[PDB]
Design a protein around this ligand. Structure first.
Ligand SMILES: [Mg+2]
Ligand SMILES: [Zn+2]
Ligand SMILES: [Zn+2]
Lengths: 97, 271, 1339, 97, 241
């Protein structure tokens, strides 16, 4: 592409609205995977282990005996946020996978 | 260059005034009591060298710097006319008591756009001291119950007094003048609606019976005549106050039925 | 009606007439109840009540007597709008002088009092004492006095000396200023004084005192004793949510001046001494200062606000400079905006409109149909029906909207085509549909652009949008005759594929009967779209107007070319269709259809092209694939061969053979030569890529590639953009201005590298940064050009002048650029056109030149025809329609009332968004050489060398016109060949620009006279006997004795007689400049015309805007004042002054030039005042006062067109010359006799005064004038109306000048009527102003 | 990540001119040449690079590999702006045997 | 629209459409292979012919046999995701190699049949799959219309930004466009009657309802403010004369 269209192409991806159904692009650049982890909207597991119970509102995981302290090993509650009013009046939700 | 400031050009003229001596000021007050045009004029310049230092202390108020100097002069004129030569007191010692009262007399009348009497300003300055004192010992945001507790005042009274200090900011400082609207109706569609509605009322009162129309035109004054009460309209058409009230309900129902079949709904009028 | 508004000072008796009461108390409202009280700023006794027909007590609230007054209080009953007209005034104890007469640089009080600006301020502040009415005293009125100085003055005088200090001392002098006697003192001493700074002060004294008395103004009206107050409705107190309210900044300024006035009103009987009576007056003088204007001297501040107080001077100006906020923008009703959307199923004379917008914009129109039909008698019942959106409302909504046109316009408008009326059609959606063909005029794409909408209401506006602003009327562009509704990119692509010819296709060689029978075979599938067939057509020729004939003819065309003829009407021939039908082919087709058939059939023809263009484009599979960008096999051969040559150059740089200063030029010249070699091999492969086979052996035809179709048709793309996709990009430019030595080898298809892509960013970011700045400069350029061409409206139909300008084709250069037929198209003729033979006439009078006369003049050999230009026709108050050319939008002549001044300024600012050797003479054509303005004597050898600096070589063709005209330098050797045919490329001159040739017409022995050795000449030779001559010395490096000596090599006969040249008694002599090398020694015979000595020798918007401002460049060219003898000044004096001495009349006056610039140091030559001496930029100021007005208009149009033709735009010459007429309206007077010496008067005002004064007994009352060129910024302020000068810039200086002068304004312009509210005098508003003046002239 | 040049202690949009609104050859690996918001402020606002890292004093630094005369070592160093004029920075993609 | 390629030179937009066809083309063969109930050993060979065939990163032979094969086949049934760096993209020879595996034409173009006329197109067109976006430029917040509303106090001008709003500012450049034509009644209508006229707009609204298109002269409210403000400075104005 040209340098003029690359400047305008970088603005179309900035002012994008999240749709109802999310579909991964067939063609990517490789940076689409490392850009979602650094953002604060994705839930990243801190302590690895076995998922005891999962729900649409919260995700509870059981911490293994290796990477845990002496007391209160399996204490980790991940509360997923529901639709809240964003700064640009757009819905924000998290879905378990 | 040199700017002809009102404060610099005034203070330069003060240096050309001799000092006031306690021995001669007593003799000058004796000549002013008998009556002399030059005695009161000369003695006015003696106490004038003190107005530049008294007004310089008060700052950060509603009045400008030049207003404190002119107001302080009016205090010594009312103080030099009343002096006791037999008491032996100093003339300047009595002048400093009137200029301080005259400064505070004008600091509360020209500080706000709304003219306020002495009865309501004596409560705002006290609450201003109470709001500053209670905020120092507590070191937090003062509440409405805290002011009414220390001052021993009702909770409803301290709310109305604090609301009088409007302190309105600017308007053109951005605009605000373009965003504000008018409270009165100015829409062309609303003014045309009031025209068609008023013309239909005079048309409906004429299309009905002539007897049922003149009993309501004199009671409420819809046709433009003077309004009359039940006793005032009794001596006009019928002295029987009960008979003229029955026909009012009959004309009220006829005007209601003629409005429903006219294509206009009563519930749609208020909306 | 009303007119003739006046501006003057207010009198104390007049202020008390507008006022209804006196205010003395700053209190205006109460805290107990939000109702005003008596004697306040918002009071009801002076101003109106707070509501309609109400009072303070509330006893009378009826509508029977609206004019009655209340008896309990002073507030009477009135309406609610009465608070905007009533006003009050304050009573001041001491008068205070205003600041308007002291804020401007020339103090209006000081010029009338003969005082300075600082001295008039020292008296008002009680800082110095002045004396008035001295009489028999030595003290003067202008002299100052102190406290001790005034006391000593009374001791020596004793009486007749009154010294007053303050504002009353200044007012006491204005009453006895004796203005009638003060003018006599300056007029009697006018011839006595002789100074430059005193004459200018004398002119301002007489021009202001004459206008002061002629206006009926009084001197005591400058200072005002009372101050009027603004009505309270302009500064209201509106409460908002929360119990709070708002107060304007003006209420605080009025409160400060009222309380200080009462403090002075109560200190009049307290026997105040002198110490305080002088300071309390300054407290009031500074309050009026803060009320009038802030930021200049006072700069008053308030609490909790860092910005200064908004005074009365800052509220009228506002933002956007001096222009008011109301003039720059005004909100209107019945408007809206939405996103555009292209619709192919819409007619040209209509557009789209959503149902949700048509119901809100036409809301009052729906209420008029429901009451007239009988469905809803009450307007309230009809309002509830339109909101519910029942099925009956949609019936009347489509009925009220059937022929009511609406307006559509984009947000930025640069020309008249931005606002075009359309017929709304109800659609379903939330977007406004637009026709695809009118998008070229709106300059808007379907990428998110929002357009406005407007709804006309009155019956006069509906007929206006159907006659002039309709979409079917403005087809031709206001700049050139080319239509703007030309088929766009998408429809042209569909038409280019239709008009094609294939070598082998299905259904070739068949014969069809008619166009209807040929179309039947294509839809059946037995005939291809482009195949060689033989059809019979039926066309009509319109060679004779009023008669149409039919004829049958069988031609050999294709199936696609025959289907296109079914779209064009029968009025046009068939030869306009057999072409390839590119983008430029259809642009010439609509322009030919507009001038043959008419307009009713052109709209139908332009609409049918969009339908047949889109229908045949959707059937085509035109798509851009990766295989379309073909790469030629010769690309790898040129790159590998160029890479091996650079390796040979860089290896020689390390050895020391080639330098770095020359290596940079060789690399950029090697890759550039390789850049064109790839482009020639790429286009040769793309044009002949498709190879078809028929009847055995294969053949070659034009390639049907998808990328080549978009370039050959010209619909979208250019030829340079192909070199970036399938070819090398080449060298790129650095932001600093240099070019990188190494180019980009790869292209967009093969992929760029990380470093090669970083180079292309330098040119891309610079391009994106310029498009953000041109929007501000082009918008600022069109505002200065339209503000000087508003009062120019065509009002006359017959002027009667016989002047004009000579028109000639663009003969400069190697070939012609602009023909004659494209320059005089639409311009009437000035004089009679003459044939090459005498006693012959072609055009009898000033007839309008049309397309019929263009071909009539092209067949003849006529090339120089004079036309009538807007710079001619000196009539006043507009420009006649005869001298003006034809209309640009309409094919007929310009009617009476069209504002040609606005359409001329917009045609220049419209294309602003798109705009950012000489050794020998080699002719490219052949013809007879004809020399003009060249004086060359014969040569004994036969070379015919001409040493004249004025001359031009022109070759004439067989018809007699000059095809090519070159420039001949001075000292060029050229052989004449008049009457002989010249071959192409033959050398005619062999001059050398490195050395300045010096020749002498005298033929004989030459001897140096006045040459001193060691001072003027130095015997310096070269090494190894390289040059053995006599080198002269410089003027600055010479000694003091040889500074005033000038060598002069006089030429005489060999026998000893003095030889002189004919024409002048002075004998011809050879020039000997400084640092000259004479090869021929003295005492030897020299031929005539031989070399005597050897002497060695931006662009864009800032360039086009520099010509209209008459800005002098940094380096101006030096010319001659009066023609005659040319010489050299004295070098010892320090100023080279070339003296002149003509043969007819000797002029002792001359000019001096500094020694900083060296040019034409030759001693002894002709003057040639018309010819330039110092090479460089030429200033337009010196050209007007030297040659005349015809060359200045010819120079401006020539230089302006060279800037617009570089980008590719074409602008007619009528709009460039229209602005030149307004800039040449001001003239200067040298010897008036009837007016001032140096003043600025109009040319039309001086011509009427000259002609009227000539009709007398003396016949010499008139005077002489001189034309002067002014810029666009200075010509805008030189107007009689103060409204046009206040809205442009600096409304403070123009508002004060109109006060002391008392000018009466006559509303007869365009910008003056848009602020008052009346109709404009241009357009359809001329008939309204014609009946107004007719009624006024009758009495 | 967006870094702007306006605000307190910086040039505004009007007094910028053309030098501030232009790209410099020293923006290789530090400032994105192609990412720039279009409009009135073109060139004043420019985003950082992917491997951009601030220096100790506050300057911009970019990572580079150490290249010897025989082979390319795996030592990665962060180079400053003024110190990049001495060394010869090669291309990211080159022929490797 | 294919006409935007030459001027707006973006070759990567066409190469993305061709590469997107091979991503969805290979996804249909994997989803169809699951419906035939093929063995797990046959699916591992097809996945090895995709990641371990073209140049780049190849990762396989590190997952479970039965568990991970059915998990990847059900997730890649809607397209195989492709990664193309910003400067290390795949050449033209590698894109055409993927279309050959999916039994698709390597040219990337195919002739499409029309739906309205039913006739086949003359030239082959380019089809594929392109990742599209949606910007926050909805027309619900852009469409506005207002006939009559409220006005200010100092200047009787229509307001904007309230609950009911929507209007276009008639700038100065809009005035010069009307002066270029012969329009005089339209320029005076939208400057004196349609705005800055209290008694003018009241009588004009009543004339439209009755059905009489007529206009009164009136006086602009923006001019009466300039008269009162210029008189307080001491300057006299003889407006009547
Ligand atoms: Mg656009
Ligand atoms: Zn009352
Ligand atoms: Zn004329």
């Amino acid at each position: 592409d040209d340098a003029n269209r690359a400047l305008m192409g970088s603005n179309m991806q900035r002012q994008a609205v999240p749709t109802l159904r999310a579909d991964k692009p067939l063609v990517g650049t490789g940076m689409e995977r490392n850009v979602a982890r650094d953002s604060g909207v994705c839930v990243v597991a801190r302590r690895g282990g076995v998922i005891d119970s999962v729900d649409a509102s919260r995700v509870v995981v059981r911490v293994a005996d290796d990477e845990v302290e002496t007391g209160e090993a399996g204490v980790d509650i991940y509360n997923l946020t529901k639709y809240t009013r964003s700064n640009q009046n757009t819905c924000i939700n998290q879905r378990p996978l | 260059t040199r700017a002809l400031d009102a404060t610099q050009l005034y203070l330069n003229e003060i240096g050309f005034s001799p000092l006031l001596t306690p021995e001669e000021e007593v003799h000058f007050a004796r000549l002013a009591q008998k009556g002399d045009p030059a005695g009161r004029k000369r003695m006015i310049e003696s106490n004038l060298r003190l107005v530049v230092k008294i007004a310089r202390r008060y700052v950060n108020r509603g009045l400008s710097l030049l207003d404190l100097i002119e107001e302080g002069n009016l205090g010594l004129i009312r103080a030099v006319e009343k002096f006791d030569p037999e008491r032996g007191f100093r003339f300047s010692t009595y002048a400093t008591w009137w200029i301080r009262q005259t400064i505070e007399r004008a600091i509360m009348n020209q500080t706000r756009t709304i003219r306020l009497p002495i009865h309501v300003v004596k409560e705002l300055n006290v609450y201003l001291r109470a709001a500053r004192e209670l905020t120092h010992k507590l070191d937090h945001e003062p509440s409405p119950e805290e002011i009414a507790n220390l001052l021993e005042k009702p909770v409803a009274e301290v709310k109305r007094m604090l609301g009088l200090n409007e302190r309105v900011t600017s308007v053109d400082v951005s605009t605000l003048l373009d965003t504000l609207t008018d409270d009165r109706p100015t829409d062309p569609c609303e003014l045309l609606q009031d025209d068609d509605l008023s013309e239909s009322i005079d048309q409906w009162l004429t299309e009905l019976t002539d007897k049922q129309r003149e009993v309501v035109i004199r009671r409420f004054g819809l046709r433009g005549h003077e309004s009359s009460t039940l006793e005032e309209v009794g001596q006009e058409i019928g002295l029987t106050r009960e008979r003229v009230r029955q026909i009012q309900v009959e004309a009220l129902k006829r005007l209601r039925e003629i409005l429903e079949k006219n294509g206009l709904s009563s519930d749609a009028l208020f909306q | 009606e009303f007119d003739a508004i006046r501006i003057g000072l207010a009198s104390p008796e007049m202020i008390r007439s507008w006022s209804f009461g006196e205010v003395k108390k700053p209190e205006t409202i109460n805290y107990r109840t939000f109702k005003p009280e008596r004697d306040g700023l918002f009071c009801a006794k002076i101003f109106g009540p707070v509501k309609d027909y109400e009072c303070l007590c509330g006893k009378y609230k009826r509508l029977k007597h609206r004019g009655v007054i209340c008896e309990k209080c002073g507030v009477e009953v009135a309406l609610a709008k009465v608070r905007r007209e009533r006003m009050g005034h304050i009573e001041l104890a001491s008068p205070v002088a205003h600041i308007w007469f002291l804020k401007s640089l020339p103090s209006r009080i000081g010029l009338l009092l003969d005082m300075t600006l600082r001295d008039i301020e020292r008296v008002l502040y009680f800082e110095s004492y002045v004396v008035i009415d001295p009489g028999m005293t030595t003290l003067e009125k202008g002299q100052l006095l102190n406290d001790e100085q005034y006391f000593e003055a009374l001791e020596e005088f004793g009486d007749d000396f009154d010294a007053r200090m303050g504002a009353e001392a200044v007012h006491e002098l204005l009453n006895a200023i004796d203005l009638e006697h003060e003018i006599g003192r300056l007029r009697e001493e006018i011839p006595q004084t002789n100074s430059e700074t005193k004459i200018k002060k004398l002119s301002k004294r007489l021009k202001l005192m004459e206008a002061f008395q002629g206006s009926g103004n009084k001197p005591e009206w400058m200072v005002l004793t009372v101050l009027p107050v603004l009505p309270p409705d302009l500064r209201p107190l509106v409460p908002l949510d929360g119990g709070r309210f708002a107060t304007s900044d003006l209420n605080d300024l009025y409160r400060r001046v009222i309380n200080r006035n009462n403090r002075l009103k109560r200190l009049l009987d307290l026997a105040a001494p002198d110490i305080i009576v002088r300071n309390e007056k300054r407290m009031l003088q500074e309050a009026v200062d803060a009320l009038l204007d802030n930021g200049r001297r006072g700069r008053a501040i308030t609490g909790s606000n860092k910005r200064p107080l908004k005074s009365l001077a800052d509220m009228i100006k506002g933002k956007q400079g001096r222009f008011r906020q109301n003039l720059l923008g005004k909100r209107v009703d019945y408007s809206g905006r939405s996103v555009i959307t292209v619709g192919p199923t819409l007619r040209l004379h209509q557009c789209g409109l959503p149902k949700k917008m048509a119901l809100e914009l036409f809301k009052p129109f729906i209420f008029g149909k429901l009451e007239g039909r009988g469905m809803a008698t009450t307007i309230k019942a009809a309002k509830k029906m339109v909101e519910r959106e029942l099925p009956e409302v949609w019936d009347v909504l489509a009925e009220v909207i059937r022929e009511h046109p609406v307006l559509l316009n984009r947000a930025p408008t640069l020309h008249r085509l931005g606002i075009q009326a359309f017929e709304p059609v109800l659609i379903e959606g939330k977007a406004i549909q637009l026709h695809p063909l009118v998008c070229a005029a709106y300059n808007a794409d379907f990428d998110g652009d929002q357009m406005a909408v407007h709804v006309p209401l009155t019956l006069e506006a509906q007929l206006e949008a159907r006659a002039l602003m309709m979409s079917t009327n403005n087809i031709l562009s206001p700049a050139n005759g080319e239509p703007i509704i030309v088929p766009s990119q998408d429809v042209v692509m569909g038409l280019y594929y239709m008009t094609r010819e294939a070598i082998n296709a299905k259904g070739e060689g068949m014969a069809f009967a008619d166009l209807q029978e040929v179309d039947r075979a294509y839809r059946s599938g037995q005939a291809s779209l482009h195949a060689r067939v033989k059809v019979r057509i039926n066309e009509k020729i319109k060679g004779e107007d009023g008669q149409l004939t039919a004829n049958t003819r069988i031609v050999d065309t294709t199936v696609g070319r025959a289907l296109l003829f079914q779209v064009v009407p029968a009025g046009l021939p068939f030869d306009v269709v057999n072409q390839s039908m590119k983008k430029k082919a259809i642009s010439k087709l609509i322009n030919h259809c507009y001038r043959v058939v008419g307009l009713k059939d052109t709209v139908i023809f332009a609409d049918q092209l969009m339908y047949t263009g889109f229908a045949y484009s959707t059937i085509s599979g035109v798509s851009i694939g990766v295989n379309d960008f073909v790469i030629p096999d010769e690309k790898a051969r040129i790159i590998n061969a160029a890479t091996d040559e650079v390796k040979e150059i860089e290896s020689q740089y390390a050895s020391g053979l080639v330098t770095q200063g020359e290596k940079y030029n060789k690399v950029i010249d090697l890759w550039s030569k390789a850049n064109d070699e790839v482009s020639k091999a790429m286009m040769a492969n793309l044009s002949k890529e498709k190879v078809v086979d028929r009847e055995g052996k294969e053949v070659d035809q034009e390639s049907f590639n998808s990328m080549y179709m978009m370039a050959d048709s010209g619909a979208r793309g250019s030829a340079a953009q192909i070199r970036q996709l399938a070819g090398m990009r080449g060298l790129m430019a650095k932001p600093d201005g240099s070019i990188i030595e190494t180019p980009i080898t790869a292209n967009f298809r093969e992929g760029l590298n990380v470093l090669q892509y970083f180079i292309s960013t330098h040119g891309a970011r610079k391009g994106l940064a310029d498009t953000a700045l041109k929007t501000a400069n082009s918008g600022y350029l069109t505002r200065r050009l339209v503000d000087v061409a508003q009062d120019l409206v065509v009002t006359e139909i017959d002027c009667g002048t016989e002047h004009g300008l000579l028109m000639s084709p663009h003969i400069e250069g190697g070939d012609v650029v602009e023909p004659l037929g494209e320059r005089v198209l639409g311009r009437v003729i000035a004089r009679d056109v003459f044939k090459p033979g005498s006693d012959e006439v072609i055009v009898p009078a000033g007839t309008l030149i049309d397309e019929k006369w263009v071909d009539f003049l092209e067949v003849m050999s006529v090339d120089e025809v004079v036309v009538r230009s807007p710079i001619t026709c000196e009539t006043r108050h507009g420009i006649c329609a005869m001298c003006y050319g034809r209309d640009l939008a309409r094919g007929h002549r310009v009617n009476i009332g069209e504002a040609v001044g606005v359409i001329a300024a917009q045609s220049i600012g419209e294309p602003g968004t798109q705009l950012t050797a000489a050794d020998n003479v080699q002719v490219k054509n052949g013809g007879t050489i004809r020399l003009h303005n060249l004086k060359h004597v014969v040569r004994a050898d036969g070379a015919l060398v001409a040493v004249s600096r004025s001359g031009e070589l022109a070759v004439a063709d067989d018809f007699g016109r000059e095809r090519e005209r070159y420039k001949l330098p001075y000292g060029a050797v050229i052989s004449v060949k008049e009457g002989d045919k010249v071959d192409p490329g033959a050398i005619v001159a062999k001059w050398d620009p490195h050395t300045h040739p010096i020749v002498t017409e005298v033929d004989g022995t030459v001897a140096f006279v006045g040459m001193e050795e060691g001072i003027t000449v130095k015997r310096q030779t070269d090494e190894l006997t390289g040059l053995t001559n006599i080198e002269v010395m410089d003027p600055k490096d010479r000694p003091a004795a040889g500074k005033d000596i000038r060598p002069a090599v006089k030429l005489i006969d060999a026998a000893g007689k003095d030889l002189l040249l004919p024409g002048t008694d002075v004998p011809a002599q050879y020039f000997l400049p400084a640092n000259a090398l004479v090869n021929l020694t003295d005492g030897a015979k020299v031929s005539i015309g031989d070399v005597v000595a050897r002497i060695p020798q931006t662009g864009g918007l800032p360039r086009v805007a520099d010509l209209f401002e008459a800005r002098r460049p940094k380096e101006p060219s030096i010319l001659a004042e009066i023609s005659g003898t040319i010489s050299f000044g004295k070098e010892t004096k320090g100023k080279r002054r070339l003296v002149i001495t003509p043969n007819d009349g000797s002029d002792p006056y001359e000019e001096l030039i500094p020694k900083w610039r060296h040019l034409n140091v030759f001693e002894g030559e002709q003057v040639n005042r018309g010819e330039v001496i110092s090479d460089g930029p030429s200033n337009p100021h010196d050209i007007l006062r030297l040659l005349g007005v015809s060359s200045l208009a010819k120079y401006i149009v020539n230089e302006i067109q060279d800037v617009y033709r570089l980008q590719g735009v074409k602008i007619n010459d009528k709009h460039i010359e229209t602005i030149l007429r307004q800039m040449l309206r001001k003239v200067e007077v040298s010897e008036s006799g009837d007016s001032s010496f140096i003043k600025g008067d109009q040319v039309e005002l001086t011509q009427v005064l000259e002609e009227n004064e000539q009709l007398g007994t003396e016949d010499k009352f008139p005077a002489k004038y001189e034309r002067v060129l002014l810029g666009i910024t200075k010509a805008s302020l030189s107007t009689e109306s103060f409204i046009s000068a206040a809205s442009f810039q600096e409304t403070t200086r123009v508002l004060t000048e109109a006060a002391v002068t008392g000018k009466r304004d006559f509303l007869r312009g365009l910008k003056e009527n848009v602020v008052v509210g009346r109709l404009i005098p241009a357009g359809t508003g001329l008939a309204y102003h014609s009946e107004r003046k007719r009624q006024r002239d009758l009495g | 990540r967006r870094v702007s040049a306006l605000g307190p202690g910086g040039l505004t949009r009007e007094r910028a001119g053309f030098e501030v609104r232009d790209v410099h050859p020293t923006h290789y690996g530090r400032v994105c040449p192609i990412e720039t918001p279009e409009g009135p402020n073109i060139g004043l606002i420019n985003s950082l690079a992917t491997y951009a890292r601030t220096n100790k004093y506050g300057f911009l630094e970019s990572p580079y590999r150490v290249v010897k005369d025989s082979l390319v070592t795996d030592e990665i160093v962060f180079l400053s702006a003024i110190e990049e004029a001495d060394h010869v920075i090669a291309q990211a993609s080159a022929t490797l045997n | 629209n294919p006409l935007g390629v030459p001027s707006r030179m973006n070759v990567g937009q066409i190469l993305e459409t061709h590469l997107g066809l091979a991503a969805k083309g290979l996804g249909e063969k994997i989803n169809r292979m699951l419906e035939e109930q093929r063995k797990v050993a046959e699916l591992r060979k097809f996945l090895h012919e995709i990641y371990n065939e073209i140049g780049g990163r190849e990762e396989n032979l590190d997952e479970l046999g039965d568990n991970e094969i059915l998990a990847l086949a059900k997730n890649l049934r809607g397209g195989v995701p492709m990664a193309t760096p910003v400067f290390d993209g795949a050449k033209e020879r590698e894109i055409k190699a993927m279309l050959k595996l999916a039994d698709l034409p390597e040219s990337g173009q195919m002739r499409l049949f029309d739906g309205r006329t039913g006739n086949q197109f003359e030239r082959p067109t380019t089809v594929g799959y392109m990742y599209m976006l949606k910007l926050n430029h909805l027309v619900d917040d852009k469409m506005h219309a207002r006939s009559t509303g409220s006005y200010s106090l100092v200047t009787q001008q229509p307001l904007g930004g309230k609950a009911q709003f929507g209007g276009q500012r008639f700038g100065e450049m809009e005035v010069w466009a009307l002066e270029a034509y012969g329009a005089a009644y339209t320029l005076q209508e939208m400057l004196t009657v349609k705005s800055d006229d209290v008694n003018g707009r009241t009588k004009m609204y009543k004339n439209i309802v009755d059905g009489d298109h007529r206009m009164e002269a009136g006086m602009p409210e923006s001019f009466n403010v300039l008269i009162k403000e210029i008189r307080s400075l001491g300057i006299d104005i003889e407006l009547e004369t």
